């Protein structure tokens with residue numbers, strides 16, 4: 001796609017800290033940009049929609065190439081259309097925003113410049129952020145994560161993409177998502193099927209795969225930490241059901257692991273660690289700090305801070321595994337006790353280290369789940385299982401919770417605030433901000 005300017009594009013500023021092994025931190029100035037899927041896509045030479053509701057213009061978009069040649073992405077009114085605001089080091093995303101139309105959630109990228117994404121090399125480093133999940137009920141996900149996206153949004157590889165990172169192009173993740181409207185500088189109108197339960201979305205003939213570090217998928221009830229490896233580290237198109245992921249009838253596709261090696265302390269048996277109010281170790285009615293460390297072995301370490309008290313990731317015992325480090329022993333024990341082979345089949349933490357060795361883009365989002373009602377995060381899943389099934393129970397939410405139409409109607413003013421991002425060598429991010 002190209003870019004049009006019927007609506008101005010002003011990225012909300014966002015600062016973050018870069019810390020050094022020598023004990024100091026330096027303020028960095030960036031901004032956030034909304035993903036291309038949330039934007040108005042219209043004809044380059046008029047106001048005619050290329051995409052409207054959950055259907056493409058059959059005249060502007062008769063095939064993927066012609067569509068991209070005829071169509072552009074336009075600017076975003078971040079606050080008034082999308083409920084996205086920033087203040088210094090703080091980003092807030094509102095769940096439902098009513099303007100001329102109804103918007104649900106947002107997916108945003110941290111920028112280095114007004115035309116490029118920030119790339120972070122996680123290996124050997126740690127990432128800290130503060131989060132307020134108090135206004136996230138059952139069925140919502142305030143997500144902070146990394147993906148192996150191109151810094152330019154794909155412009156250098158795909159000449160027919162001239163909108164780039166400035167307009168939120170080039171998304172990929174471990175679901176190899178087929179809901180994207182543009183992949184590799186072409187539309188996704190070929191094979192498009194509208195969603196039966198979402199007036200604004202559908203599933204195309206292509207998807208966009210890449211490695212994914214899910215640092216944080218959470219609400220006020222449950223939280224999870226999940227690396228996902230792919231056989232190709234970086235952004236790669238996939239065809240139809242070969243994509244696997246949420247958007248394919250067969251979840252287990254050819255290149256990415258859509259399950260990951262997940263760590264949810266509730267799922268692992270500690271139902272008292274994280275939840276709303278003073279009966280939990282971490283009280284989700286109050287802001288908390290989350291620190292994630294990528295040791296050069298390829299293992300992942302985690303600790304939390306609230307009201308000046310530090311907690312390592314809680315210990316878990318699972319088969320022969322015992323500890324709080326996410327390592328090959330944990331991931332292998334998890335497959336043996338909870339089932340599945342996706343993570344190991346796609347090369348496990350060894351393959352995942354190929355992604356953290358390189359650059360990855362920071363994503364912050366808020367979404368509800370039109371496929372599985374977020375039950376995998378915060379409830380019993382599958383819903384016919386009980387606590388006698390190892391791993392079935394992931395949080396205290398009813399298996400009835402998280403119907404999109406219901407949570408959109410009942411909790412439209414749900415929101416997530418991410419703040420005080422700090423990045424640097426392992427051990428550096430608890431030092432004074434600059």
Ligand SMILES: O=[N+]([O-])c1ccc(O[C@@H]2O[C@H](CO)[C@@H](O[C@@H]3O[C@H](CO)[C@H](O)[C@H](O)[C@H]3O)[C@H](O)[C@H]2O)cc1
Pocket residue numbers: 286306307308309
């Ligand atoms: O030692 N520490 O590092 C430490 C100790 C206590 C503590 O308490 C939390 O402090 C924050 C910030 O002052 C509180 O949040 C604010 O509370 C206000 C209540 O009127 C209002 O809602 C503000 O918007 C909100 O940010 C929080 O309730 C405390 O538990 C933090 C750190």
Ligand SMILES: O=[N+]([O-])c1ccc(O[C@@H]2O[C@H](CO)[C@@H](O[C@@H]3O[C@H](CO)[C@H](O)[C@H](O)[C@H]3O)[C@H](O)[C@H]2O)cc1
Pocket residue numbers: 175214217226246258259260262338339340376377381382
């Ligand atoms: O018996 N088993 O082996 C079995 C049966 C069902 C099942 O459900 C999967 O659980 C995983 C771990 O929670 C779920 O994965 C996640 O999917 C999210 C949305 O796509 C997001 O990708 C997370 O980061 C990821 O872990 C998966 O959706 C369930 O189908 C697991 C095992």
Ligand SMILES: *[C@@H]1O[C@H](CO)[C@@H](O)[C@H](O)[C@H]1NC(C)=O
Pocket residue numbers: 269270271272273281311312313314315
């Ligand atoms: C849950 O983890 C916290 C933090 O490590 C610990 O203090 C508490 O004892 C744990 N409770 C259970 C039931 O494991």
Ligand SMILES: [Co+2]
Pocket residue numbers: 083094
């Ligand atoms: Co608001």
Ligand SMILES: [Co+2]
Pocket residue numbers: 174212214226228258259260
């Ligand atoms: Co995931």
Ligand SMILES: [Co+2]
Pocket residue numbers: 206239
């Ligand atoms: Co094709």
Ligand SMILES: [Co+2]
Pocket residue numbers: 295297299325
């Ligand atoms: Co270690």
